[PDB]
Amino acid sequence: ASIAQARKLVEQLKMEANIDRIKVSKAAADLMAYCEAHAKEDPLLTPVPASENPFRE
Amino acid sequence: CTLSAEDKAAVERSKMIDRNLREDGEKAAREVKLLLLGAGESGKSTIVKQMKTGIVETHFTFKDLHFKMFDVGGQRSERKKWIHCFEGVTAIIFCVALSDYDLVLAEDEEMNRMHESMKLFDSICNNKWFTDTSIILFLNKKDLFEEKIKKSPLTICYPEYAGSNTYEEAAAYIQCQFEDLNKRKDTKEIYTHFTCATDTKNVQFVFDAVTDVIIKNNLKDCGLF
Amino acid sequence: VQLVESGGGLVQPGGSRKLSCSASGFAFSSFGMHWVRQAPEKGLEWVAYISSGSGTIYYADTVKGRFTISRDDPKNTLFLQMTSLRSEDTAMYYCVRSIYYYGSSPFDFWGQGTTLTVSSDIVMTQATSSVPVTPGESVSISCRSSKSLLHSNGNTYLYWFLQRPGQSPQLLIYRMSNLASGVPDRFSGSGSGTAFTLTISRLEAEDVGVYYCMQHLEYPLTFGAGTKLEL
Amino acid sequence: STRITLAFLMSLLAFAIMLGNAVVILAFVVDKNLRHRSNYFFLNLAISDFFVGVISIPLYIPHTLFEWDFGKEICVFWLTTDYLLCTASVYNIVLISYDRYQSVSNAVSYRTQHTGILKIVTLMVAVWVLAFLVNGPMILVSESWKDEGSECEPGFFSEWYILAITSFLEFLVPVILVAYFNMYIYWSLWKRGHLELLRARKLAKSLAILLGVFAVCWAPYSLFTIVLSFYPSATRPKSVWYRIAFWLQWFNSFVNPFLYPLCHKRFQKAFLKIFC
Amino acid sequence: ELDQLRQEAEQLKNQIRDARKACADATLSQITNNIDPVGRIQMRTRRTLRGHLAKIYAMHWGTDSRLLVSASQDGKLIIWDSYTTNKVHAIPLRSSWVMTCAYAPSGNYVACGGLDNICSIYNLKTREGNVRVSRELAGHTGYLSCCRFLDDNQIVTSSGDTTCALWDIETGQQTTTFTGHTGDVMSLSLAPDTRLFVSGACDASAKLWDVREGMCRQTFTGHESDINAICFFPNGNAFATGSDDATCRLFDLRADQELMTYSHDNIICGITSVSFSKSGRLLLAGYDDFNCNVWDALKADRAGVLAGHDNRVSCLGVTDDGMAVATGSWDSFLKIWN
Ligand SMILES: N=C(N)SCCc1cnc[nH]1
């Protein structure tokens, strides 16, 4: 009964614990470089001219 | 008009869609809604039958009034994740079986089914969403209860009981115990009816409770009462 | 899915007539409807238009004041009643559907048509009248206008229709760029402002017919002269 | 001396009548969910009281003060408008009381019903036309009776039968109807049902406040005018109490926004949304 | 021996935690301290779409960022044009209890689901000129929380029975079943490359699933309450989770650890929806206090609020080109902000 569930949980833990991981600093640098690499085409950050956006009042 | 012919036709189509939507809303805003919440799935089917997947909708008509009854007994999911969908329902119909006072719910050593019914009634009645909706109690299976109570006195369910073992002053005790779980008597009322297997006036009782609730809500909205 | 039109025949001049158009296989109530004329030896010509729900009705100046259009929604029927007919009304009549919403394709389906015998506007010119060309080679058909068909919202209103001999007109490209559904990808359309061109990369035996350029910027819906593709 | 403070108080009352009814109108027009054949009556009441404040008081203020801007061509119009607006305000309370009576007597028919905009427009137009037809034509006919001296008052104050008939027509029938509707509502709720006693007491107080206010605001002027009309030739020299009774009826048109639409619990949502 | 298996699981999770602790080098704030803050953000309400009569429970932008579908308790599914106010379509549903909706990437199909345990797929482009039911996918037992199209023939659904499914629309039969969650699954989102997807459940944890293999890849935890919303970063290497304890959290797939948490003392109510903006610099999160906060992804500080709804905000979305945002609330009013 519960023995099968426990065995499945142990197998899942074993197959998930072997994943290789990198340092948090590298991931933070990647997210940074992405954010400041695409800041030009983000209308919500830099407001576009009122004569270019399609939505108007 | 600075609009092309196609834009004008699209505007006309949108206006027609608006008209259809408002007509449908006006038609559907004049219907009574009853959420049928049971306790252990005891007697729900019989009460549904006498009033003619995951949710069952029952539509019927009585005295030029349209009633829609929603049954959610088959969800068996976490009630707190979708109960707010039923906020604004006209009434909540609660079904309680009187017969399982002696019976003990399975997988538990000593945990009475009436205790489950009381716990669920307490949870639903004092919910933060149903602070104004009215509860219609339905104590059913009262006959074989009447023969069973003669064999065993009504003391297993409630140790703090002292009275005659007869039907009188015993079912009323359980009804009073259920009605005492309410904590918002100022803004909520509970209706109770003992229903037999061959009873017919249950629909009439529901109609009377619904019209009383409608009158009271209408007068409370205006600032009176 | 189909439109059947009844009426026509011979009419004594000065009389009256009623033509009926019955639809089957689609939601008739949500489609605007058009009556379109075609002279026995000339090109197509717009006649009348009725919206969905009969909200707006438009007539051509040639028939305004004597013609009447009507629709029957509980049934699926369209009526055109003509009075004081003259010798210029003898022609073929077509009953066309058109739906209007963002991304819709008006003039998608055309009826069979019925024959009747009796005994400013945006002008568009089609200098082409006959283009003899062997199958297998690309061909181009040009159509000019007299006013900017482009609109302030970026939309352009130019439709292309094909009429094979002994058949009914078929929509090919709407808004000069969007290919209609159910046609081969050989056809293409291009242009800007005044002059436009339709290009066929590979001709086949089924591409022989007459091509019409029609404008939907504003009523009346003027048609082109039409050009033929001989072999 | 006294004229300055009298003008100040009159202007303050007029400005309050401006504010309450303007608030009610704006709250009605901003929201689109108040279309339940019952807020239109509140709209009519607000319109009537708003025009009262706009027209009746600002024109009357110079007359009673040292200023003499009176005229024969303007006084008839002022009287007709004032009586129209007051009678329309009276006849709109009866409409709301009848609506509540219908709501309580038969809720099933009151719920599953589609009257439409045409019925509401017809009811409003009928109310206004009846309010005019009660008194305005009589003022127009009787204007010829007065000749110089006293003016800008109805010409039928000399006659007692006309005053009795009119006072009956727009005071006795409306008050009887409102009293009957309120007592029917209270009796129905009492027979239908410690908490109940408190609810019944609150309902009785709420129902009695409206009727008492209406009676105390409309009886004194009518009855006191009727008893004064018995004096032959010119009436008895008007004291302060006659002017107090005159101003009480206008003062009634100030608490109407406070009573009927302010407590509807759906105009309160409109007020909260507007102010926040 | 069950106890031996439990001890083994405890040892494995302890060593996983130790490895995760050893993998951490520096905090996200320690690296982002030098970044220039975006400053206060002031948005305006360009459009106000009205016509619904009950609470709006879901919405989803089109692939062209011009059309959008919305679902409410009325039993209606309204397809709006956004540049204009016109209603392109209004589809009546067979069940009035709808809690999710999706719009196909090709624009030819729409999806809906709710308490009826059935996912309805509607076809928009047809010869008859009216929208008709194309498919009724059934097989889930618990209520349907979210649905997301992959292509015209495959969909992914999550139900309240702690289960996710990959449905083939043509045959209608389930293809792959994802199980392992303890609590009810509330939301999911697909990766930009459409190869993996994250699912957040009611057991205060999230999981990463591979659609091809069908097996769970990674699991993330740290929230103390229910998780209501989840969404990938535009890069696809991180995702944000909104929970019921008034906290948002950013998790990284490669680092396998949370990076930053967004919380404030003035907010106590839970979070209904979370969505990144273009380039992933901003993070718009709806709240139960009728407002919508705009947090910074690199800065934990706030950057603006959106207050135009009289009731709880139940859904929000950002266009593909990042030109405008849309919010739907329990008040029957959709709003477009820019
Ligand atoms: N007779 C009626 N119902 S209106 C009385 C007009 C009025 C007199 N003073 C203030 N208002």
GROMACS .gro file of N, CA and C and ligand atoms in nm, chain D residues 82-83 86-87 90 135 170 218 221 246-247 249-250, ligand 1:
model
   50
  595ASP      N    1  -4.413   7.741  -0.847
  595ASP     CA    2  -4.398   7.699  -0.708
  595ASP      C    3  -4.502   7.593  -0.672
  596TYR      N    4  -4.629   7.618  -0.707
  596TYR     CA    5  -4.734   7.522  -0.675
  596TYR      C    6  -4.715   7.392  -0.753
  599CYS      N    7  -4.425   7.201  -0.572
  599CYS     CA    8  -4.466   7.146  -0.443
  599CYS      C    9  -4.562   7.029  -0.460
  600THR      N   10  -4.661   7.042  -0.548
  600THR     CA   11  -4.755   6.932  -0.570
  600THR      C   12  -4.686   6.812  -0.633
  603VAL      N   13  -4.516   6.633  -0.358
  603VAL     CA   14  -4.614   6.557  -0.281
  603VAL      C   15  -4.651   6.428  -0.353
  648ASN      N   16  -5.388   7.256  -0.953
  648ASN     CA   17  -5.396   7.393  -0.903
  648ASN      C   18  -5.367   7.500  -1.007
  683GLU      N   19  -5.491   6.778  -0.258
  683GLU     CA   20  -5.351   6.739  -0.244
  683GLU      C   21  -5.299   6.739  -0.100
  731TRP      N   22  -4.700   6.965   0.612
  731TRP     CA   23  -4.802   7.007   0.518
  731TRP      C   24  -4.936   7.046   0.580
  734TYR      N   25  -4.992   7.489   0.728
  734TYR     CA   26  -5.018   7.597   0.633
  734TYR      C   27  -5.157   7.585   0.572
  759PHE      N   28  -4.566   7.918   0.612
  759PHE     CA   29  -4.532   7.933   0.471
  759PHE      C   30  -4.396   7.869   0.441
  760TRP      N   31  -4.297   7.897   0.525
  760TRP     CA   32  -4.162   7.847   0.501
  760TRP      C   33  -4.144   7.701   0.539
  762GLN      N   34  -4.326   7.441   0.455
  762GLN     CA   35  -4.347   7.354   0.339
  762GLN      C   36  -4.224   7.350   0.250
  763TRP      N   37  -4.159   7.465   0.229
  763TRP     CA   38  -4.033   7.466   0.156
  763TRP      C   39  -3.923   7.394   0.234
 1128LIG     N1   40  -5.080   7.396  -0.183
 1128LIG     C1   41  -4.976   7.330  -0.209
 1128LIG     N2   42  -4.980   7.185  -0.206
 1128LIG     S1   43  -4.822   7.417  -0.248
 1128LIG     C2   44  -4.799   7.557  -0.135
 1128LIG     C3   45  -4.699   7.656  -0.194
 1128LIG     C4   46  -4.606   7.714  -0.087
 1128LIG     C5   47  -4.637   7.814   0.001
 1128LIG     N3   48  -4.531   7.834   0.077
 1128LIG     C6   49  -4.435   7.749   0.038
 1128LIG     N4   50  -4.484   7.675  -0.063
   0.00000   0.00000   0.00000
